[PDB]
Design a protein around this nucleic acid. Structure first.
Lengths: 46, 271, 94
RNA sequence: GCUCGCCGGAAGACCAAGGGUUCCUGUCCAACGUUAAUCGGGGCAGGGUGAGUCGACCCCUAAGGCGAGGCCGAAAGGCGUAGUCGAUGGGAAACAGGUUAAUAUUCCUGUACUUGGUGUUACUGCGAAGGGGGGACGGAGAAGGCUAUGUUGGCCGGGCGACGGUUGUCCCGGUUUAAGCGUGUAGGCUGGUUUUCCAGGCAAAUCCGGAAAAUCAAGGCUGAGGCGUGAUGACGAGGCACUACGGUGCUGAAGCAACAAAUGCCCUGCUUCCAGGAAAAGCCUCUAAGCAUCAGGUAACAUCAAAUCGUACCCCAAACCGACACGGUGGUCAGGUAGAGAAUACCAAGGCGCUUGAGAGAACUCGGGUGAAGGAACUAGGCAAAAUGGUGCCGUAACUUCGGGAGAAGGCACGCUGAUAUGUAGGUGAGGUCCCUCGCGGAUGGAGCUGAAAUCAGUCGAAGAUACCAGCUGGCUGCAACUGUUUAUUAAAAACACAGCACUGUGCAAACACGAAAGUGGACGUAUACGGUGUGACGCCUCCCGGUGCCGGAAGGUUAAUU
RNA sequence: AGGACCGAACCGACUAAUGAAAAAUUAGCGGAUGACUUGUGGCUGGGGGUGAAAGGCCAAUCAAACCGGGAGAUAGCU
């Protein structure tokens, strides 16, 4: 059965990657939030 | 000519083809071509703005000349061509100076016919001259509404317009709709009717044919649930309401012209 | 033209392994560890100057670092650049 | 190690994606492995991924994204021009053999190619953000020419049979060879060459386009395959020396022909249809500003250059997505016998026996086999089973929209051997002989090879479409015309859609829709068009305006802000 | 020629019996040149999308997704 997650690196990066997050305001805020929390992996970026 | 196809299969039974042998069997004039990608009836927001559009065959865009400005040069018709972009047929013409253009093929036009634009041009089919030069009572097509803009009225397969009157700076046209309309007398127009008049006699004959023409199927509002359409819901088949659009506006009669800027040019509305 | 200092900083070490020994003995090819940033021409220049020996050609590759586990803690070894340097016929290297 | 069994259009081989060391070697067996474990995709250590020509990067663009100015917007921001990104598409170049425990079109051996510089001598119009050409394009169908590949014969090597026979019309194996370079064929497309002029190609153009005029019928482009060379080479069945029993080193015959033949190539071709079928660069070409005897261009020759990143391994799976060593997952390769076949059966190459076993041979459950007599009596219901099942030929009703119905129904033949005919009809096609504008040519010729289908005669069986495979059929009737779609995971239908019909709106800055707007779709469309609503092939058809809607009217009544 | 026929791949999911499986199995079943199917990338966003329309689908979630916040909502109820 085709399960929901069907990985694709490029698609992952474009969707969720660092630059994408940077591009828009809301993404930047998300980034800031994650930094505040102390996340080790700020983004999906490997 | 129209051709009723033999019923060797359902979906072929009711088919009627409109076959013109005189069209060009060959690849169109490539210089005048250009790309034309499909919308899916969706705008820049990405939302569907006009339902029932989608798919269909890849099509190129022939660059038709509706402005028709090569004044004084006589042109000769090379061939008639299938345009997927319109109900009419187009004609590839060759001006004496070596330029080629696509034009709406009028009714009587065929290969070898000579045509001409200009004030001086001769009043014969396919020739184009300002409507102050065109005699009253003539049939014309590809009519400009604004001078210099390009023909906008009467471009569809078997349309034409009647010049009923010329009163000073304006002439009054009889549009195919039956609407009588004033138009500036200096606007341009092409003599005769537009060509492919038996276009209406074709019948698709199956669902797939409609799809080929980029038309997605139509769901009736009454078949929906109320949350979707004003007509939705009802146990079994119920329709206890006045007909309306998906957006609640009355459909069977309610007029919707709101343009107060051009009211003056409409002599008489259609009926 | 490569600067001497850069040349000196290129070459990290000789690589000892069975495959390396075989390459040395048969094909007259030395296997070096080099700076990850070091390009082929650079490596060649450095070979020529610092080992005083003619080079035919350099093949390079990047070795990825192994993931290991010290006790309970996971940790990755460094990636590093390997270079097969083929030396001109009759070139004997100390 | 020897037997047995399974897959073999896969359960084999190679990739992409995704994973990220799982690869190889040594070592260990606590935990992990549904048992044991000396084994492991487990632990620990070490090793392993070599590129000018493969891919990325790079040049070009699609859908789309971002977007200087700009337009719009309380703010945030939205749209969008110039631009710039964006492959899943276009754009230069490599093949064969050998080698590692583990990489290889990357190492080695041989033989190649590419496109840049730089320098040269030789020549002499070069030059783009611009013009033109090209790239550049659909579906289906039909062949013909080919090859991949396979079969047989020939040849070469080996063999003479654990049991009757087996020196022959016997048995086993092998019989392979690239890119490149030369040739330019089967075939496809197109008339060429020169001269003159011209409101066209945002300017110019010697280019394209268009007009004339002259002259010759061959000119050019394209093109699989074959042939030659590449190759006195490599590889080569197996023989022979050493042996850490893993292998290593030497050596090495023949290496031809015919037939058959793709879904691969010629073919981005041809024929045809309507639903009318990317873009841009690379590439060719034309000039402009320019420069002017310099640069630049093309000409060979020399030299330098090709960086960087990926390259292990799995990849229909125990390594990816599924919590698991648990169904899903795109591409490429496609042997033999039978067969229409990529179905099916048995096999090859190759890969596996699915990580608990041993007994026993109760009930009951699951999955199968057979069954006297009856044959739907079962049951809500013939559910399920059983049955039918192929090719050829004969034959086939109502009704019909004249196409259908129809494989209607129902029947007959079917194996093997011999003869017709020491293998026919056909297909292919060598020598020889003749012609020739000479070649991959044309005629004639028929050797050899291959080879159905039929008829007649015989013959065995209970049975010859013998296994696997492979329609059940007919009669009346509701609904829906039909092919389609649908509740992912209890509903596939009479529901939706449909072609068709009708009403209605909409004159283009269209109606309408998304948008505080700008704008966008509608549509690069224009009433033979587009939108909305209902009905729903086809046939015969299809009173009430009082109510509520809509349309038109505006005499009077009433009536806002305002005053 | 064909939204033509029989039929593998491929797409589906009518009947049947039966956790390896949070929808599968085997045996049969429908389509199989098209209103087909499929890879890669792109766009549409929550009273919003998309919808051959079933209130279907929008990450095992849908008559209004998920995450965080108002928030210790309110609970004459248990």
């Amino acid at each position: 059965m085709k399960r929901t997650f069907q990985p694709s690196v490029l698609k992952r990066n474009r969707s969720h990657g660092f630059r994408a997050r940077m591009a828009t305001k809301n993404g930047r805020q998300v980034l800031a939030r994650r930094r505040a929390k102390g996340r080790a992996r700020l983004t999906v970026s490997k | 000519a129209v051709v009723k196809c033999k019923p060797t299969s359902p979906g072929r039974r009711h088919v009627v083809k409109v076959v013109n042998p005189e069209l060009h069997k060959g690849k169109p004039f490539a210089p005048l071509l250009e790309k034309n990608s499909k919308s899916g009836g969706r705008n820049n927001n990405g939302r569907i703005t006009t339902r029932h559009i989608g798919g269909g065959h890849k099509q190129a865009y022939r660059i038709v000349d509706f402005k028709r400005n090569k004044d004084g040069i006589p042109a000769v018709v090379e061939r008639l061509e299938y345009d997927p972009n319109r109900s009419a047929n187009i004609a590839l013409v060759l001006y004496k100076d070596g330029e080629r253009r696509y034009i709406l093929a009028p009714k009587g036009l065929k290969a070898g016919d000579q045509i001409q634009s200009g004030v001086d041009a001769a009043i014969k089919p396919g020739n184009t001259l300002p409507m102050r030069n065109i005699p009253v009572g003539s049939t014309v097509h590809n009519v400009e509404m604004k001078p210099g803009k390009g023909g906008q009225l009467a471009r569809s397969a078997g349309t034409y317009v009647q010049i009923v009157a010329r009163d000073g700076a304006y002439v009054t046209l009889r549009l195919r709709s039956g609407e009588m309309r004033k138009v500036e007398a200096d606007c341009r127009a092409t003599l005769g009717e537009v060509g492919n008049a038996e276009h209406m006699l074709r019948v698709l004959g199956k669902a797939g044919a409609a799809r080929w023409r980029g038309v997605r199927p139509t769901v009736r509002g009454t078949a929906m649930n109320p949350v979707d359409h004003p007509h939705g819901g009802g146990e079994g088949r119920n329709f206890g309401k006045h007909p309306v659009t998906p957006w609640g506006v009355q459909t069977k009669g309610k007029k919707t012209r709101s343009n107060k800027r051009t009211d003056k040019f409409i002599v008489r509305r259609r009926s | 033209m490569i600067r001497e200092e850069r040349l000196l900083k290129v070459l990290r070490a000789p690589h000892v392994s069975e495959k390396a020994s075989t390459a040395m003995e048969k094909s007259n090819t030395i296997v070096l560890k080099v700076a990850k940033d070091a390009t082929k021409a650079e490596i060649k220049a450095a070979v020529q100057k610092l080992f005083e020996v003619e080079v035919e050609v350099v093949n390079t590759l990047v070795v990825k670092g192994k993931v290991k586990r010290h006790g309970q803690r996971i940790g990755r070894r460094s990636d590093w650049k390997k270079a097969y340097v083929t030396l001109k016929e009759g070139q004997n290297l100390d």
